[PDB]
Design an enzyme around this catalytic site. Sequence first.
Site, PDB file in Angstrom:
ATOM      1  N   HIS A   1      -6.231   3.837 -18.774  1.00 47.29           N
ATOM      2  CA  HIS A   1      -6.040   4.914 -17.804  1.00 47.29           C
ATOM      3  C   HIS A   1      -4.889   5.844 -18.169  1.00 47.29           C
ATOM      4  O   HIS A   1      -4.595   6.768 -17.396  1.00 47.29           O
ATOM      5  CB  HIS A   1      -5.855   4.354 -16.391  1.00 47.29           C
ATOM      6  CG  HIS A   1      -4.533   3.692 -16.144  1.00 47.29           C
ATOM      7  ND1 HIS A   1      -4.421   2.351 -15.844  1.00 47.29           N
ATOM      8  CD2 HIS A   1      -3.274   4.190 -16.108  1.00 47.29           C
ATOM      9  CE1 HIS A   1      -3.152   2.049 -15.646  1.00 47.29           C
ATOM     10  NE2 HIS A   1      -2.433   3.147 -15.804  1.00 47.29           N
TER      11      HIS A   1
ATOM     12  N   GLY B   1       7.536   2.312 -13.671  1.00 42.45           N
ATOM     13  CA  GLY B   1       6.724   2.566 -14.846  1.00 42.45           C
ATOM     14  C   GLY B   1       6.610   1.376 -15.775  1.00 42.45           C
ATOM     15  O   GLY B   1       7.006   1.452 -16.944  1.00 42.45           O
TER      16      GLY B   1
ATOM     17  N   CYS C   1       3.577  -0.232 -16.216  1.00 40.37           N
ATOM     18  CA  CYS C   1       2.211  -0.279 -16.717  1.00 40.37           C
ATOM     19  C   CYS C   1       2.182  -0.496 -18.227  1.00 40.37           C
ATOM     20  O   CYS C   1       2.889   0.179 -18.973  1.00 40.37           O
ATOM     21  CB  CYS C   1       1.506   1.026 -16.369  1.00 40.37           C
ATOM     22  SG  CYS C   1      -0.221   0.878 -16.500  1.00 40.37           S
TER      23      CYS C   1
END
Lengths: 299, 295
Positions: free
Chosen positions: A39, A141, A143
């Site tokens: 993503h 952050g 991810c």
Amino acid sequence: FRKMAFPSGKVEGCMVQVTCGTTTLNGLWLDDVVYCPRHVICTSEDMLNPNYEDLLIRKSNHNFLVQAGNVQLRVIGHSMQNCVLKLKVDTANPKTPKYKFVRIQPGQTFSVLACYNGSPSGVYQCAMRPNFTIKGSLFNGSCGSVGFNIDYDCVSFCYMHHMELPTGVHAGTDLEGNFYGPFVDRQTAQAAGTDTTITVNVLAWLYAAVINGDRWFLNRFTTTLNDFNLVAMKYNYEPLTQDHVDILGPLSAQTGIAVLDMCASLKELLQNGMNGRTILGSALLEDEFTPFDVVRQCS
Amino acid sequence: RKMAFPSGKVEGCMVQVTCGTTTLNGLWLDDVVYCPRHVICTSEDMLNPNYEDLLIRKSNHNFLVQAGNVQLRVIGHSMQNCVLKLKVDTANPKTPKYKFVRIQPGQTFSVLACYNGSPSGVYQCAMRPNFTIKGSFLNGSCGSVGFNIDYDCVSFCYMHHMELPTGVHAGTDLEGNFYGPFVDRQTAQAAGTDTTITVNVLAWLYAAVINGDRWFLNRFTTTLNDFNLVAMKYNYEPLTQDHVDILGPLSAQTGIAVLDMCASLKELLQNGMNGRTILGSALLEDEFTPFDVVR
């Protein structure tokens, strides 16, 4: 009895930053491939109902900015494997450890190296919950941060962080891009199922307490697998299998407490509480040590 | 989640130190290896060791230092308080930016637990008010170190020397000075009654309010003295005016006065959790410092 994370050095040397447009997250650099959540190619508008096959056909190598510290790695190829984006890069990582990609089962444990924009921030030990979520750190952050176990000099990567769920827990994939749990990489409504306690891990931890001299919860009784399971379901505990009993065998041999004897102790603890006592300095039962972890640590 | 620091910078500094039949961990920084001076003791020596006498009898070649598969040649040795400093032939090419710092009870740090030079696991902990550390399973983890990392600089604050009878650990700073009243001698020394690090609990309650959990607040306040009179009945450490000042930023962030949060803590001690959790914990956590909480 302290939970420990694996030493993170071998994974630290693999963490990089991946940027695609306005979106930046963490990537894993192994030899000449960087792995990260697919993503990263999504805008916020695309993330509502993305068509990843089409969105990637519209991207080129020049759309990807990969930085390893103060060094840009030039991307020379891109592809997807399930929910993981694979960026072929200029340079093989000279710090690549011996490694494998493995998929773990709910209830198993691993360490997570929490990273912010390619920079390692902290490491923690956790278990994959039975509902397939990870009760994780508070980052913004992180991810693309990964989870792993280490055996000898071999890093077994088992998890990559993809999504934060509304309840505050994390969801992700294995390194081949297969999700853990019934989740998708999309900005839609999704929630963790009702979680349960990892029974086989609680039993392992009670064995650890016995190896460490705390024995007050042992009793004279035994139970049956069937009737223990009826007590488990009534207390939001996972059911125990014959395989679980077999896994606990080494600890039963070492301590002299049969597994169904330990189940009798746990059944009593669940019905009557601790009565003011502690087990390993803890008034609550811990379920994030596997039988393997306890064998490794104690015996 | 209580996270440890990434341990890679310390992993590159761990070595094995052997003297006679005793082996433990050492820390290799530049051309010096630091390790507990009781590496020169047998088990019997530990009852009443005379370190000056044991050390004067050693030569450099009595110390075997192994960094992975490489033997490091010792070319000098010296004792500083309870730490041995072995000068070696070679400066550690993996030496990070580092400093030595002495910490105070309540401060947090990560420990890289090692066995015979090999890193085994990392955990985050606090120096307890009784100057001990709740440690890990490893038997021979002596010489393992504790550290913080700030802006790529490792501040080493702890080296493990002794296992205490109740299972906790005692040790020194990297200048060899023990934390607490403990000694590198097998005596009857024992950890005193531990207490809870009150200022850390209050910082963590502020973190909880900042993250959106407010159920434990109440409408009461307290004087500092009344709070300490109550908290001591639960074996909580006294809260000082320094502690109140330190919490000021979080008080300002959340709009909750420090003594109002103290009033909430008093009620939490009186009532327990009633089945609830505060961040993800069913227990009052005391191993996050106010420095930790702000970010």
